[PDB]
Symmetry: C2
Subunit: 187 residues, 2 copies
Amino acid sequence: EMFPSGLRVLVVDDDPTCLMILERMLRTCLYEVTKCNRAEMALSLLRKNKHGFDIVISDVHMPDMDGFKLLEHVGLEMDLPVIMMSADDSKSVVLKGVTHGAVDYLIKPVRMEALKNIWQHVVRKRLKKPRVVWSVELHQQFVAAVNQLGVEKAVPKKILELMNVPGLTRENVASHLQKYRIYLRRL
Amino acid sequence: EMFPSGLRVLVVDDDPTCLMILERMLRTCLYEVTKCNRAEMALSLLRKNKHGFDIVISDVHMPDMDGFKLLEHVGLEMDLPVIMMSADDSKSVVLKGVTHGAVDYLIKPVRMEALKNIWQHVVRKRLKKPRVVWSVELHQQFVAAVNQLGVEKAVPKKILELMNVPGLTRENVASHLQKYRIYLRRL
């Protein structure tokens, strides 16, 4: 089966053991890895080179910033795939990862198969217009709406009815659902 | 005539004399001023609190980043009003300020009237949808198109014809033109 070697991953964690594990497993899986232990530094590294990182993995806890708001900055503001690394697997923490913008999550202890499969949010087998940026408030309304209808039955028109946001289009919701589908199915 | 006192301005300059002048004049004009001497730090200060700064003034030259790309980060990526502070007033530098995302510019020496009038890009006398973010490449095509048609005659349909970007709408161009109208008229 197909495997995309050489994707570039930024791993953000103030825990050196967690960082070492993630880096070693990603290199075993042929990803290219950049490590960083501060949220502010991660954000600077991502702006420094847009079209430089394919996916970010960041710890739910960070020493210089609330970890969930880093998820918002990376996953929503910058529209990058961000994966939440958490030691806590309660329903509330897992729900908060996706409500703050992550496309997926990893629970300690991280299994190789789970870690290796993160490329699914980046590549697929088969000058452009302005990109649309979702606010955290809008995103949380979307997650609530989709969870109410059921992820398998939620169609753009029904999501829109529940969100009740003038100007929000069917296309906007469909492309947002495609980005967050995998996480929402895990719920 | 109406004057909006108390707007919050971030001034970004590694030249302490320039920073002191801008801060003193802005405080005389009743703005609230935050100073910062590094591009990276400016960017962190702006994310730290969105809905915190009303307008940014940044020097065309910065020691830790190309000044024009800071304009892109602030004016286009973050969609804040950024004003280019420059000692150079050549046609090429002035054109580059607006092609990299600034809504206006200030030339040394800065006159009080010019400095005091920066509120025009922020306020006016009379949960929402995703915001649209322009890439620098798209923005530069837009500036070229508008300059070809003439800023006073440029209507969205004609701008679109010249830009030739599938998916770019009339509404997108009209709201972009409204943001950059003042600078483009100065050209």
